[PDB]
Design a protein around this ligand. Structure first.
Ligand SMILES: [Cl-]
Ligand SMILES: [Cl-]
Ligand SMILES: [Mg+2]
Ligand SMILES: [Mg+2]
Ligand SMILES: [Zn+2]
Ligand SMILES: [Zn+2]
Length: 1143
C-alpha cells in the first residue's frame, strides 16, 4: 500500500499557506521512497511552479503543477455585491501547463474581484491538457450538495463533465467534519452513477501535524489580531497536514472506501508528465528585430556610423575610405558592414590610435556575432536612443555593460570605455556562453514612458514587468508572532535586538546565543519556535522597480501575469525564475540624480541662456574638484554620506579617476586602503613595487593610475592577462574563480599562473606571492565599468553646484517640491548659503521655481488653492497684457470665471500679490473689488467705450496690519511651508529653555547615555503630533499653538508637555551669552560681577564653542534679578529666560 498527495498548498498560497517548499519536499520524500510525487496546487496563482519544479526535480521528487482556482458563479466579468467557488486543477501534459499559465494569467487580468477568478467559460476554452477534481468543501459540486440543491449540483456535475470529459474526478477528502460526511456520501453516489472514479486528497496548508498553532497564528498575522480575539481567523481543526498513507486510511477506512481512491492518487500523478524548459533545455528567447540587412550587419553598421560621431579627431570620413581602398558618410558604414570575418583578418598583420579603435571595435563585434547576441544589442540600443530624442534622460550606464566599446559606440553606454580602464571582456567573456545583462538608468520621472515605448513597440502581450516576493525576516517574524501572543511591545523589541545582523539583514533564527531567555517563560518558548517555523514565508507581490521582460513569443504562452494596483503588466514568476526560463530580461532603474540634472538644465537655460550639454563637458574642470575638495558635497550624487564627505575633504581629488577610486574603496573592508591612497595622493609617500621587481614592468601601467592599489577588478584581470599570459577572457575566469573560493580548484590556477609567469619574467618566488597578492585584493576589488560610469554623474552634479550654485538649489527645491519637509529643509540650506528664497509674485514669477537675477523665486503653481489652469492662465494674461499694475487691473483681466475668490485669497496669502501693498488690506478689499470688477463688464457689454465704462478701481479698502503669527499662519496654509520667518522666532522664551534644536537632536543625543530623555520646543501640526522648529520636523507622541516637550529618545516618544503661558509663568533665570573669545582674566570678571548681586535665580552660560555649543549652568552663585540691568551694561548679551530646571 501507498499514497501521494495531489492537493497540497504551499508558502505560495500567500494568505493561508504555511508549507515551506523545502521541508515539505523532503517530508514527502522521507514518507514514500518509491516513485514519490507532489502536486503544487496554490490558491489562485502559479507563483510556485518554476522555483518548485526545479527544487523537487533535483531532490528526487516528481512534481505536478496545479491550481486551486477561484471560479465565479457566473462570468469573470461579474462584480456582484453570487460568490466564487474553489476548483482543483492539475496539468497532465505540457499544453496543460500552458493552459494553466493562461488561466491564472486571465484570472488576474480579466476576472479580478476580491480574489482572482476564472469563468467556467474560459475554463472550457482552456481545458485541453487538464485534469480537474470535484473540489474542497468550498468548491461547487460539494457546496450545492450542502445546500440540498442536489438538482443543481448534478446539473453542474454534468456541465463540468461537458468540459473535461473522462479527465474530471470526484474529490474525496476527510477531516473530522460533519459537512464532509454528507458531501461525500453523495459525491460517492455521483462517482458511481456517471462512472467517474474518486481521488483521495486532503488539502495540506501546513507540513507536519505539529505545525497546527504555528499555522493558526500565520492566520492571526494575516488577520492582524490576538491569539484570543475571537472571531480571529481559524481553521475548523488541526488536520491539514501532509499525512502518511496510514493517517489517510484513518480518515478513509477500508470496508467503507476501498482501494480505488488510493490507487488513483498514484496513477494520476504518473500520467502527469510535465517538463519546464530549464537547465538541460532552456532556449534563448531573444526577440526578433524589424529591418535587406542581417541582424548582425546593422549593429555593425550602427557601430561604424557611431564611432565617427564618438571620436571626432581620430575617426574620420577620410579614414574609413582608406580602409576600403585597402579592400556621403552613412554610405561608408553601410559598406564596411559587409566585410566578412575571412576577409577582415588580412589587415592587422600589415596611446589609443585610430586603428586601435577599429580593432577593439571589430573584435567586440566578432565576439558579439559569434555568441548570438547582435539582435539583443539592437533591441537595447533602439529603445535607449529613442528615450534620448523623446525627453527622457539616460544615464552613462551601469555595471559591466559600460566597458564594451560597441555598447558605447551605439549609445547604450555613455562613457568612453577606453579613455578609462574599462574592459569588454568583463561584460562578455568570449570563452563562456552567458546572457549579458544590460541594465540602464533613466530619469525617474520619465522611466515608465520608456517601458511604454517597449510595450507598444514589441507587443502588449510580450512585454511585462517582473514580480518580486519579499521574505519574512527572522527579526520581523519574531515581532509579528509576539503581537499575537498577547505580549508587551517593549520586551518584544528586547527580543528582537538579540538576533544578530551579519550583513544588511538579520541572521536566521536557526543558529540563534542568549537562548536561556526561552527557559524562563513557556509563553516565549513557542513564540521563538513559531517564528522560525514561519521564517521563510512570504509577504505580497510588488512589482520590481527595475524588472522588465521582452519575450519573443506571447507571454501568456509560458509565463503568467498580473496587473498591479496602478495597471502594470506583471510577471508571476520571480527574477531568477524568469531568467531560468531563458527570457530577455533588463533593469530599467529610476534615478533621482538624472531628473535633477534635467530640471537644473531647464532652470539654467532659463536663468542665463546656457545649453548644459552633459555629454560634452570637460572632466578636468578645476572649480568642480576644488568644491569636492572643500567638501561641499551636500547635493552631490553618491558622495553625500555623513562619513564619505569627511573622506573627500582629506583626499582633495583632482581628476575623475579619484572620484572613481574614492567611491570604489569607500565601503567596509577596502575602506582601510584609503589612508594609503591619500598619503600617496598628497604626494608624501613613494608608490613602490620592490615586492615584485620582475613584475613591475607589468604592474606600473595598471596600478599607477591608482597610486598603487588594486582597487578595480579590471586592474586584476589585466595583471593576470599580462603577467601570466592569460587571454583577457581567461583572466576574468580567474577573478571569477577566486570569488567562488573553490578550496582546491585554486591550486590548479596557481600552477597555470606561475608556469606562464616564468615564460614572461617572474621567477615564481615573486609569482606565488603575486598570485597571493591577487587572491588577497580580488575579494574586495571593484567593478570600474560601474564605478566610473556613476562617478561621471557625481562630477556632472558637482560641476553644476560649482558653476551654477543658485539654479542648482532651485532645481533641488523644484525636484522635491512635493515634500513639505524637504522644501523647508532645502530652503534653510539655501537661506544660510547667501541665497534668498522668495514668495511667489504674480508679476515676476514663472510657473515653477525660477531664478531671477541671483535669487530663487517661487512659482504660482506652488500656491495651494490656485488651480493649475489658473496658474498658467494668470501667466498668459500677464504675457499678452504686460505686467500687472494694480489689484484692480488684475481682477478685470482675470475675471472670477478664471481665478475664483478662494484662489485669490490664497494667492494673496502666499504673497504673490504682495507687489500691491498691505496684505490684510488686500484680503478684505477683494470682495468689494469683485463687486466692482463684475460690474465694469456689465457697463462694458452695454456699449460704453472706456471712460463712461471705468470708474477706475477706487483705492484699496482699509484695515489694521497682519501681526506676524497671524501673517505666518496664512503663508503655510497657502504654501505648505513658512517663508520669511517662523512662529517660534517671535516669542523666544521657548528657544532658551530647550535643550536642543530639532536639527542637532540626533547629534547631541546619540552621545549621552542609553535611551535618553530630553526637552524640545517648537510648533504643533497634528490631531502623533508633529513638532517644528525653524530647523526641522519630528514625529512625536492643537494646530498653531507652541509647546515645550519632555520626551524620551532612541524617533522620539513624549512624556510631558507644557503650554506657553505655563512656561512664561514658571519663575525666571539669568542666561549670559558668552563668546569663545574670553580671557583667563574674565572667568573672574563675570564671576565677580555675579558675586556682587546674589539671590535666588540660577545662572546659565551659553558658550558658543568652535564646533557645537553647550549650556554651563553656573555653580554655587545665584543672582538676584537686578543683575540683568547692570549686566547688559558691559560687552555681554543677556536674557531673562525661563528656568530650565523645574521641567
Ligand atoms: Cl602592490
Ligand atoms: Cl599595496
Ligand atoms: Mg467548475
Ligand atoms: Mg539586468
Ligand atoms: Zn486555503
Ligand atoms: Zn484548497
Amino acid at each position: 500500500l501507498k499514497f501521494a498527495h495531489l492537493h497540497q498548498h504551499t508558502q505560495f498560497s500567500l494568505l493561508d499557506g504555511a508549507a515551506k517548499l523545502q521541508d515539505l519536499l523532503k517530508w514527502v520524500k522521507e514518507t514514500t521512497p518509491e516513485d514519490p510525487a507532489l502536486a503544487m496546487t496554490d490558491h489562485g496563482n502559479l507563483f510556485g511552479a518554476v522555483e518548485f519544479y526545479k527544487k523537487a526535480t533535483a531532490m528526487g521528487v516528481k512534481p505536478i503543477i496545479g491550481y486551486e482556482a477561484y471560479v465565479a458563479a457566473e462570468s469573470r466579468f461579474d462584480r456582484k455585491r453570487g460568490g466564487y467557488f474553489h476548483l482543483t486543477l492539475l496539468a497532465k501534459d505540457f499544453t496543460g501547463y500552458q493552459n494553466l499559465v493562461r488561466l491564472a494569467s486571465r484570472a488576474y487580468l480579466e476576472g479580478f474581484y476580491e480574489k482572482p477568478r476564472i469563468d467556467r467559460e474560459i475554463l472550457r476554452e482552456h481545458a485541453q491538457g487538464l485534469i480537474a477534481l470535484s473540489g474542497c468543501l468550498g468548491a461547487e459540486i460539494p457546496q450545492f450538495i450542502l445546500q440540498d440543491r442536489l438538482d443543481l449540483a448534478e446539473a453542474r456535475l454534468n456541465e463540468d463533465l461537458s468540459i473535461f470529459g473522462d479527465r474530471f474526478f470526484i474529490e474525496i477528502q476527510n477531516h473530522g467534519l460533519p459537512e464532509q460526511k454528507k458531501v461525500n456520501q453523495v459525491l460517492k453516489e455521483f462517482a458511481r452513477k456517471y462512472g467517474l472514479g474518486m481521488v483521495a486528497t486532503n488539502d495540506g496548508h501546513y507540513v507536519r501535524k505539529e505545525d497546527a498553532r504555528a499555522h493558526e497564528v500565520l492566520l492571526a498575522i494575516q488577520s492582524k489580531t490576538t491569539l484570543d480575539d475571537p472571531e480571529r481567523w481559524r481553521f475548523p481543526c488541526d488536520e491539514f497536514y501532509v499525512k502518511t498513507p496510514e493517517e489517510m486510511r484513518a480518515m478513509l477506512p477500508e470496508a467503507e472506501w476501498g482501494d480505488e481512491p488510493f490507487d488513483n492518487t498514484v496513477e494520476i500523478a504518473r500520467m502527469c508528465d510535465v517538463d519546464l524548459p530549464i537547465g538541460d533545455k532552456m532556449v534563448y528567447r531573444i526577440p526578433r528585430f524589424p529591418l535587406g540587412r542581417t541582424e548582425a550587419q546593422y549593429l555593425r553598421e550602427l557601430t561604424f556610423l557611431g564611432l565617427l560621431r564618438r571620436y571626432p579627431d581620430r575617426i574620420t570620413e577620410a579614414f574609413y575610405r582608406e580602409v576600403l581602398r585597402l579592400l556621403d558618410e552613412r554610405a561608408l558604414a553601410e559598406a564596411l558592414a559587409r566585410v566578412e570575418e575571412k576577409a577582415w583578418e588580412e589587415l592587422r598583420k600589415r596611446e589609443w590610435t585610430a586603428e586601435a579603435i577599429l580593432h577593439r571595435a571589430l573584435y567586440e563585434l566578432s565576439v558579439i556575432e559569434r555568441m548570438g547576441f547582435p539582435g539583443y544589442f539592437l533591441i537595447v540600443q533602439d529603445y535607449i536612443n529613442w528615450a534620448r530624442g523623446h525627453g527622457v534622460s539616460v544615464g552613462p550606464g551601469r555595471g559591466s555593460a559600460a566597458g564594451s566599446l560597441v555598447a558605447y559606440a551605439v549609445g547604450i553606454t555613455n562613457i568612453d570605455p577606453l579613455r578609462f580602464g574599462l574592459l569588454f571582456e568583463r561584460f562578455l567573456n568570449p570563452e563562456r556562453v552567458s546572457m549579458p545583462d544590460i541594465d540602464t538608468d533613466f530619469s525617474d520621472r520619465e522611466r515608465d514612458r520608456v517601458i511604454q515605448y517597449v510595450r507598444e513597440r514589441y507587443g502588449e502581450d510580450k512585454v511585462a514587468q517582473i514580480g518580486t516576493f519579499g521574505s519574512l525576516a527572522s527579526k520581523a517574524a519574531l515581532k509579528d508572532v509576539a503581537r499575537v501572543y498577547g505580549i508587551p511591545h517593549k520586551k518584544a523589541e528586547e527580543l528582537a535586538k538579540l538576533i544578530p545582523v551579519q550583513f544588511g539583514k538579520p541572521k536566521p533564527l536557526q543558529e540563534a546565543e542568549l537562548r536561556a531567555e526561552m527557559e524562563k517563560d513557556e509563553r516565549i518558548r513557542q513564540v521563538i519556535e513559531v517564528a522560525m517555523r514561519l521564517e521563510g514565508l512570504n509577504r505580497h507581490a510588488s512589482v520590481h522597480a527595475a524588472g522588465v521582460v521582452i519575450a519573443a513569443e506571447p507571454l501568456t504562452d509560458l509565463v503568467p501575469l498580473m496587473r498591479d494596483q496602478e495597471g502594470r503588466p506583471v510577471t508571476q514568476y520571480d527574477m531568477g525564475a524568469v531568467e531560468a526560463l531563458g527570457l530577455l530580461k533588463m533593469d530599467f532603474l529610476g534615478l533621482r540624480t538624472l531628473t535633477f540634472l534635467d530640471e537644473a538644465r531647464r532652470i539654467v537655460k532659463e536663468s542665463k541662456g546656457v545649453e548644459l550639454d552633459y555629454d560634452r563637458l570637460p572632466l578636468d574642470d578645476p572649480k568642480t574638484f576644488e568644491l569636492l575638495s572643500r567638501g561641499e558635497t551636500k547635493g552631490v550624487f553618491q558622495l553625500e554620506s555623513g562619513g564619505m564627505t569627511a573622506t573627500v575633504r582629506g583626499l582633495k581629488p583632482r581628476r575623475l579617476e579619484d572620484i572613481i577610486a574614492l567611491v570604489s574603496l569607500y565601503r567596509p573592508g577596502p575602506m582601510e586602503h584609503i589612508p594609503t591612497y591619500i598619503r600617496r595622493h598628497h604626494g608624501q609617500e613613494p608608490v613602490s613595487y620592490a615586492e615584485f621587481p620582475h613584475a613591475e614592468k607589468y604592474l606600473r601601467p595598471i596600478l599607477d593610475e591608482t597610486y598603487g592599489i588594486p582597487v578595480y577588478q579590471e586592474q586584476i584581470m589585466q595583471i593576470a592577462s599580462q603577467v601570466a599570459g592569460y587571454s583577457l577572457g581567461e583572466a576574468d575566469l580567474l577573478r571569477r574563480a577566486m570569488g567562488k573560493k573553490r578550496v582546491e580548484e585554486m591550486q590548479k590556477h596557481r600552477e597555470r599562473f606561475v608556469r606562464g609567469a616564468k615564460e614572461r619574467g617572474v621567477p615564481e618566488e615573486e609569482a606565488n606571492r603575486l598570485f597571493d597578492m591577487l587572491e588577497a585584493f580580488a575579494n574586495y576589488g571593484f567593478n570600474k565599468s560601474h564605478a566610473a560610469a556613476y562617478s561621471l554623474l557625481s562630477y556632472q552634479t558637482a560641476y553644476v553646484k560649482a558653476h551654477y550654485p543658485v539654479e542648482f538649489m532651485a532645481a533641488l527645491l523644484s525636484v522635491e517640491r512635493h515634500d513639505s519637509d524637504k522644501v523647508a529643509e532645502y530652503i534653510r540650506d539655501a537661506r544660510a548659503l547667501g541665497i534668498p528664497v522668495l514668495p511667489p509674485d504674480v508679476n515676476r514669477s514663472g510657473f515653477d521655481f525660477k531664478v531671477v537675477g541671483e535669487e530663487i523665486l517661487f512659482g504660482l503653481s506652488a500656491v495651494k488653492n490656485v488651480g493649475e489652469m489658473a496658474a498658467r492662465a494668470i501667466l498668459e494674461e500677464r504675457e499678452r497684457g504686460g505686467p500687472f499694475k494694480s489689484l484692480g487691473d488684475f481682477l478685470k483681466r482675470l475675471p472670477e470665471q478664471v481665478v475664483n475668490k478662494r484662489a485669490l485669497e490664497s494667492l494673496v496669502k502666499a504673497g504673490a500679490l504682495d507687489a500691491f501693498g498691505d496684505r490684510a488690506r488686500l484680503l478684505a478689499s477683494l470682495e468689494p473689488l469683485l463687486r466692482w470688477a463684475a460690474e465694469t463688464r456689465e457697463r462694458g457689454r452695454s456699449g460704453l467705450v472706456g471712460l463712461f465704462a471705468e470708474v477706475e478701481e477706487p483705492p484699496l479698502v482699509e484695515a489694521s496690519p497682519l501681526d506676524e503669527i497671524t501673517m505666518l499662519r496664512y503663508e503655510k496654509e497657502a504654501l505648505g511651508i513658512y517663508v520669511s520667518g517662523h512662529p517660534v522666532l517671535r516669542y523666544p522664551g521657548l528657544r532658551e529653555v530647550a535643550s536642543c534644536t530639532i536639527e542637532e537632536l540626533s547629534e547631541f543625543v546619540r552621545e549621552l547615555p542609553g535611551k535618553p530623555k530630553v526637552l524640545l520646543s517648537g510648533m504643533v501640526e497634528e490631531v502623533r503630533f508633529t513638532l517644528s522648529d525653524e530647523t526641522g520636523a519630528l514625529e512625536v507622541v492643537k494646530e498653531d499653538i507652541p509647546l515645550l516637550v519632555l520626551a524620551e529618545v532612541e524617533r522620539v516618544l513624549a512624556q510631558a508637555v507644557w503650554t506657553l503661558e505655563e512656561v512664561l509663568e514658571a519663575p525666571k533665570a539669568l542666561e549670559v551669552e558668552v563668546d569663545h573669545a574670553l580671557l583667563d582674566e574674565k572667568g573672574a570678571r563675570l564671576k565677580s560681577l555675579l558675586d556682587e548681586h546674589p539671590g535666588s535665580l540660577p545662572v546659565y552660560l551659553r558658550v558658543l564653542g568652535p564646533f557645537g555649543e553647550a549650556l554651563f549652568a553656573l555653580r554655587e552663585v545665584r543672582v538676584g534679578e537686578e543683575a540683568l540691568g547692570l549686566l547688559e551694561a558691559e560687552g555681554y548679551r543677556a536674557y531673562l529666560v525661563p528656568d530650565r530646571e523645574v521641567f
